[PDB]
Design a protein around this ligand. Structure first.
Ligand code: J6F
Length: 352
């Protein structure tokens, strides 16, 4: 009668509490493998993520720890919530793996992106991304890495963000897995200091992908990515370069120039539901919002608050969803530690 049992998924051994049944692999993420399971105590399905030796390096260890603390203390319909945490190992020395148990949704945004959504749905998804982001922002968490693979949806269009983004500071990782850059803001690509609206860029990139069914700026590296950006939106006016460091500013002011394209050209009428008057008016509103989110210079880019006040989005506005009490966060939450120290930190958190 041990409280745990073991089953194979690919080359993984999941060792989980006996309550969780019928493990099925649904994903091979970044820090871990993810499984769907039935939880016999709660009487519902759930997602279970195995973190392997998350203390292996500092990037894994910071993400895991940040994940743990933030997920324990954020409670919001639009950020995935933690049902349960555990390790099968019994002491600090045998300690190896962390399992997070979370509510199970039906799909991620990547699958949604390959379908044609009506405006009521697309706008609802977007409204919900903005709510979740606003909530993070109100606890001083700026995400910096929204991407459709860390967003998930249910069949009834409810949506939740999976992760809490980048760690403020940051670095190297021995991996076969390459990290996705396509939704990262100009200020992050050019390392120039960011604010809250850094997450609006990512949103606009996702909305733009939703409409076009094609990653907007699919670069192999940050160089390529910046080219794909200026090709379309055009070279940022002088005022924005003035804000860059002369070292990178040099590089930027030295690319081929682009007048760059107009929003009707970037996102043509054909891409939108536009047969009834409702839909023509919505399309117009959709394109208006994109043109304010996909703005290179964050001084000119729309904010989360304004984008929630936007016509396309405003319809769903609920002050319960939008002005929810901020999470209370641990303080040094951009800290440096040896691997032995990270193991301690994480273990203590898994055990409370
Ligand atoms: C048979 C249902 C497939 C739904 C997959 C959605 N999904 C993905 S993908 N990853 C996660 C989820 C999820 O719902 N909850 C989570 O905690 N994570 C990590």
């Amino acid at each position: 009668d041990n409280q745990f049992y073991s089953v194979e998924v690919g080359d993984s051994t999941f060792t989980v509490l006996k309550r969780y049944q019928n493990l099925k692999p649904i994903g091979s993420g970044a820090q871990g493998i993810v499984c769907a399971a039935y939880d016999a105590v709660l009487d519902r399905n759930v997602a279970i993520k195995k973190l392997s030796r998350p203390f292996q390096n500092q990037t894994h260890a910071k993400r895991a720890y940040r994940e743990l603390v933030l997920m324990k203390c954020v409670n919001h319909k639009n950020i995935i919530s933690l049902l349960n945490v555990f390790t099968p190992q019994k002491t600090l020395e045998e300690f190896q793996d962390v399992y997070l148990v979370m509510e199970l949704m039906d799909a991620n945004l990547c699958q949604v992106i390959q379908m044609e959504l009506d405006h009521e749905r697309m706008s609802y998804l977007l409204y919900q991304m903005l709510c979740g982001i606003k909530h993070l922002h109100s606890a001083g968490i700026i995400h910096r890495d929204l991407k459709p693979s860390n967003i998930v949806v249910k069949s009834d269009c409810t949506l939740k963000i999976l992760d809490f983004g980048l760690a403020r500071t940051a670095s190297f990782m021995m991996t076969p897995y390459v990290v996705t850059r396509y939704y990262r803001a100009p200020e992050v690509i050019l390392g120039m200091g960011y604010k809250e609206n850094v997450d609006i860029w990512s949103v606009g990139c996702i909305m733009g992908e939703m409409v076009r069914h094609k990653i907007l700026f699919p670069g192999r590296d940050y160089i390529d990515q910046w080219n794909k950006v200026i090709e379309q939106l055009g070279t940022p006016c002088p005022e924005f370069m003035k804000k860059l460091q002369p070292t990178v500013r040099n590089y930027v002011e030295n690319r081929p120039k682009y007048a760059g394209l107009t929003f009707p050209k970037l996102f043509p009428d054909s891409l939108f539901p536009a047969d009834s008057e409702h839909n023509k008016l919505k399309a117009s509103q959709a394109r208006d919002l994109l043109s304010k989110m996909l703005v290179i210079d964050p001084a000119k880019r729309i904010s989360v608050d304004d984008a929630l006040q936007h016509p396309y989005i405003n319809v769903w506005y609920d002050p319960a969803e939008v002005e929810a009490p901020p999470p209370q966060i641990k303080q040094l939450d951009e800290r440096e530690h040896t691997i032995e120290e990270w193991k301690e930190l994480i273990y203590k958190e898994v055990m409370n």
